[PDB]
Design an enzyme around this catalytic site. Sequence first.
Site, PDB file in Angstrom:
ATOM      1  N   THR B  36       0.804  -1.215   0.000  1.00 13.68           N
ATOM      2  CA  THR B  36       0.000   0.000   0.000  1.00 13.68           C
ATOM      3  C   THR B  36       0.837   1.266   0.000  1.00 13.68           C
ATOM      4  OG1 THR B  36      -0.213  -0.369   2.384  1.00 13.68           O
ATOM      5  CG2 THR B  36      -2.099  -0.885   0.991  1.00 13.68           C
ATOM      6  N   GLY B  49      14.846  -8.182  -6.421  1.00  9.62           N
ATOM      7  CA  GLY B  49      16.051  -8.002  -7.207  1.00  9.62           C
ATOM      8  C   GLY B  49      15.821  -7.948  -8.703  1.00  9.62           C
ATOM      9  N   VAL B  59      -6.080  -2.412  -2.998  1.00  9.50           N
ATOM     10  CA  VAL B  59      -7.106  -3.280  -3.566  1.00  9.50           C
ATOM     11  C   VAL B  59      -8.512  -2.725  -3.403  1.00  9.50           C
ATOM     12  CG1 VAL B  59      -5.688  -5.332  -3.233  1.00  9.50           C
ATOM     13  CG2 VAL B  59      -7.295  -4.622  -1.443  1.00  9.50           C
ATOM     14  N   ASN B  85      -3.353 -12.277  -1.307  1.00  7.54           N
ATOM     15  CA  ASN B  85      -2.872 -12.261   0.063  1.00  7.54           C
ATOM     16  C   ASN B  85      -3.177 -10.964   0.809  1.00  7.54           C
ATOM     17  OD1 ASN B  85       0.300 -12.162   1.785  1.00  7.54           O
ATOM     18  ND2 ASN B  85      -1.633 -13.109   2.376  1.00  7.54           N
ATOM     19  N   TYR B 150     -13.781 -10.598  10.043  1.00 12.11           N
ATOM     20  CA  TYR B 150     -12.666 -11.322   9.441  1.00 12.11           C
ATOM     21  C   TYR B 150     -13.086 -12.730   9.040  1.00 12.11           C
ATOM     22  CZ  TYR B 150      -7.770 -12.788   8.825  1.00 12.11           C
ATOM     23  OH  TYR B 150      -6.576 -13.252   8.318  1.00 12.11           O
ATOM     24  N   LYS B 154     -13.082 -14.329   5.335  1.00  9.64           N
ATOM     25  CA  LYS B 154     -12.258 -15.505   5.073  1.00  9.64           C
ATOM     26  C   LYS B 154     -13.113 -16.700   4.667  1.00  9.64           C
ATOM     27  CE  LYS B 154      -8.241 -13.766   5.590  1.00  9.64           C
ATOM     28  NZ  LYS B 154      -7.134 -13.894   4.605  1.00  9.64           N
TER      29      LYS B 154
HETATM   30  N1  LIG Z   1      -0.899 -13.635  10.843  1.00  5.82           N
HETATM   31  C1  LIG Z   1      -1.687 -14.765  10.953  1.00  5.82           C
HETATM   32  O1  LIG Z   1      -1.537 -15.501  11.938  1.00  5.82           O
HETATM   33  C2  LIG Z   1      -2.652 -15.013   9.897  1.00  5.82           C
HETATM   34  C3  LIG Z   1      -2.481 -14.366   8.710  1.00  5.82           C
HETATM   35  N2  LIG Z   1      -3.377 -14.590   7.686  1.00  5.82           N
HETATM   36  C4  LIG Z   1      -3.455 -13.694   6.523  1.00  5.82           C
HETATM   37  O2  LIG Z   1      -2.358 -13.995   5.678  1.00  5.82           O
HETATM   38  C5  LIG Z   1      -1.660 -12.789   5.368  1.00  5.82           C
HETATM   39  C6  LIG Z   1      -0.429 -12.693   6.205  1.00  5.82           C
HETATM   40  O3  LIG Z   1       0.240 -11.556   5.864  1.00  5.82           O
HETATM   41  P1  LIG Z   1       0.394 -10.701   7.383  1.00  5.82           P
HETATM   42  O4  LIG Z   1       1.898 -10.546   7.453  1.00  5.82           O
HETATM   43  O5  LIG Z   1      -0.373 -11.594   8.275  1.00  5.82           O
HETATM   44  O6  LIG Z   1      -0.442  -9.358   7.217  1.00  5.82           O
HETATM   45  P2  LIG Z   1       0.584  -8.140   6.836  1.00  5.82           P
HETATM   46  O7  LIG Z   1       0.912  -7.635   8.198  1.00  5.82           O
HETATM   47  O8  LIG Z   1       1.634  -8.708   5.928  1.00  5.82           O
HETATM   48  O9  LIG Z   1      -0.246  -6.985   6.031  1.00  5.82           O
HETATM   49  C7  LIG Z   1      -1.004  -7.714   5.128  1.00  5.82           C
HETATM   50  C8  LIG Z   1      -0.793  -7.160   3.746  1.00  5.82           C
HETATM   51  O10 LIG Z   1      -1.987  -6.534   3.321  1.00  5.82           O
HETATM   52  C9  LIG Z   1      -1.587  -5.379   2.624  1.00  5.82           C
HETATM   53  N3  LIG Z   1      -2.713  -4.443   2.616  1.00  5.82           N
HETATM   54  C10 LIG Z   1      -3.369  -3.854   3.713  1.00  5.82           C
HETATM   55  N4  LIG Z   1      -4.373  -3.027   3.355  1.00  5.82           N
HETATM   56  C11 LIG Z   1      -4.366  -3.088   1.952  1.00  5.82           C
HETATM   57  C12 LIG Z   1      -5.157  -2.456   0.979  1.00  5.82           C
HETATM   58  N5  LIG Z   1      -6.168  -1.597   1.349  1.00  5.82           N
HETATM   59  N6  LIG Z   1      -4.951  -2.671  -0.354  1.00  5.82           N
HETATM   60  C13 LIG Z   1      -3.927  -3.542  -0.656  1.00  5.82           C
HETATM   61  N7  LIG Z   1      -3.088  -4.216   0.146  1.00  5.82           N
HETATM   62  C14 LIG Z   1      -3.334  -3.965   1.478  1.00  5.82           C
HETATM   63  C15 LIG Z   1      -0.359  -4.807   3.420  1.00  5.82           C
HETATM   64  O11 LIG Z   1       0.359  -4.011   2.633  1.00  5.82           O
HETATM   65  P3  LIG Z   1       1.332  -2.813   3.622  1.00  5.82           P
HETATM   66  O12 LIG Z   1       2.614  -3.579   3.961  1.00  5.82           O
HETATM   67  O13 LIG Z   1       1.417  -1.753   2.569  1.00  5.82           O
HETATM   68  O14 LIG Z   1       0.334  -2.613   4.729  1.00  5.82           O
HETATM   69  C16 LIG Z   1       0.358  -6.119   3.804  1.00  5.82           C
HETATM   70  O15 LIG Z   1       1.315  -6.409   2.833  1.00  5.82           O
HETATM   71  C17 LIG Z   1      -2.613 -11.635   5.716  1.00  5.82           C
HETATM   72  O16 LIG Z   1      -3.492 -11.486   4.646  1.00  5.82           O
HETATM   73  C18 LIG Z   1      -3.323 -12.197   6.936  1.00  5.82           C
HETATM   74  O17 LIG Z   1      -4.610 -11.672   7.095  1.00  5.82           O
HETATM   75  C19 LIG Z   1      -4.197 -15.723   7.732  1.00  5.82           C
HETATM   76  C20 LIG Z   1      -4.401 -16.384   8.868  1.00  5.82           C
HETATM   77  C21 LIG Z   1      -3.785 -15.943  10.133  1.00  5.82           C
END
Ligand SMILES: NC(=O)C1=CN([C@@H]2O[C@H](COP(=O)(O)OP(=O)(O)OC[C@H]3O[C@@H](n4cnc5c(N)ncnc54)[C@H](OP(=O)(O)O)[C@@H]3O)[C@@H](O)[C@H]2O)C=CC1
Lengths: 243, 233
Positions: B36, B49, B59, B85, B150, B154
């Site tokens: 974002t 790279g 999104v 994701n 959530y 999901k």
């Molecule tokens: N953590 C867990 O235990 C669990 C995780 N998940 C899911 O799997 C993924 C794990 O990645 P996680 O590290 O957990 O979450 P992150 O902390 O990586 O943030 C999730 C991603 O969503 C992006 N994002 C947020 N808002 C928007 C938007 N409006 N438009 C586009 N992209 C957006 C962020 O980009 P930016 O870096 O720019 O914010 C980030 O890269 C997530 O989707 C999470 O919900 C599933 C089950 C449980």
Amino acid sequence: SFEGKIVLVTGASRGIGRAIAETFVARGAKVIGTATSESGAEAISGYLGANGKGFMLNVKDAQSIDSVLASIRAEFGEIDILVNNAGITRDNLLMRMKDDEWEDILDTNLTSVFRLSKAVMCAMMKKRFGRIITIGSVVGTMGNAGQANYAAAKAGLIGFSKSLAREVASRGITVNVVAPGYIETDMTRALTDDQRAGILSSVPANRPGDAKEIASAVAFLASDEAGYITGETLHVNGGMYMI
Amino acid sequence: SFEGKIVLVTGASRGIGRAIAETFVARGAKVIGTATSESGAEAISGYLGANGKGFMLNVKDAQSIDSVLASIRAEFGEIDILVNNAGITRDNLLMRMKDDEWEDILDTNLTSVFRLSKAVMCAMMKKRFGRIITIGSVVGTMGNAGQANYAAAKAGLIGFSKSLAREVASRGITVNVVAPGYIETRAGILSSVPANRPGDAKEIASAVAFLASDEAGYITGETLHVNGGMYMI
Ligand SMILES: NC(=O)C1=CN([C@@H]2O[C@H](COP(=O)(O)OP(=O)(O)OC[C@H]3O[C@@H](n4cnc5c(N)ncnc54)[C@H](OP(=O)(O)O)[C@@H]3O)[C@@H](O)[C@H]2O)C=CC1
């Protein structure tokens, strides 16, 4: 028996909705059915009689929701049993699916469940009793070509229900879903015999379901004989899908 | 092997999204990650790279989605593998959850899957090959207190993938979901994991990589649970 129960049934003009409201009326409940038009609202009052009333409600307008529920609170009281039956289909293959079609399905069939549950369960908690039953669909579990929007909404209210159940289970409130299969509506009786036989070929029961059979399942989960059933999906599809 | 395939991973700044993007690079693919922030975008271009690039993508903005897609198709080409994701949490008990928090979860975690899957599938059908994988959650299946928004999103993307899989199965495209459990991004939730340990971000990546491979051409409409036993289906 539902003597004393205030039952709200959204989308009650015909089919499953009406059969649901008609079942609660016959079992001593004060039944409130909704339609999208004032003509439907008055049509519900006609067949509900003195046991209930019809209201005009749009599940996408928070103003219409605050008004109808306050109107229900004044002339009837606090809702004991909520049956979410507002729901449409906007079919299309994904490559042909327009945005508003996806947005309309989520607001009508999924966000509606969040908004009405939020507004009725404050009273269910303080009275340590409540029933929240949403009519989903076999499509939410099985999926279906051309209904990716529909299946997303119908599956979404299941995860919602499971989460809400965990929140309120210890306060006598159960949150459940009845998933109908092929139920004979008027749109069912209007397709070609070629179409009719096609769906029946995937139904082991070899017959369409009846709207009151969904009403029977909704009635059971709402009865006080189902206090230990929460976060569950009750499938009524004649074997079309088995989970 | 993923030589000659173009991968797009939404939300690949860190955590599970990063491990997924790095895994596809490690197996021969050309990878695009999104964030974002133009901050996080250049962070993605950094770790990818000479084999990938980052883009700023929201999104919830249709102009942002189409703009990034145009760049990808001009600089790299048609997308072969879409890993959905992007996702956020804004938890609250239901009577405390304001309508905005419900709106943001659906628009970010559910409607995003519909938008980008629809945008990539036309080229996938012309190629007669495609992979669509969406990162779900164990919560979408077991449910969780305070996370009805959530969990609904999901759980909704599983109903979406099942229907889409039926629409494109005959044209060499599969649509699947990987459902993580407890992944390290207290012991009270580790008490619910029979594995007795948190999951690693790359353990979700290995799942996603397996589904995206030519070895998984017969797996479609399926949810692969990587949770250590927190839930069993
Ligand atoms: N953590 C867990 O235990 C669990 C995780 N998940 C899911 O799997 C993924 C794990 O990645 P996680 O590290 O957990 O979450 P992150 O902390 O990586 O943030 C999730 C991603 O969503 C992006 N994002 C947020 N808002 C928007 C938007 N409006 N438009 C586009 N992209 C957006 C962020 O980009 P930016 O870096 O720019 O914010 C980030 O890269 C997530 O989707 C999470 O919900 C599933 C089950 C449980």
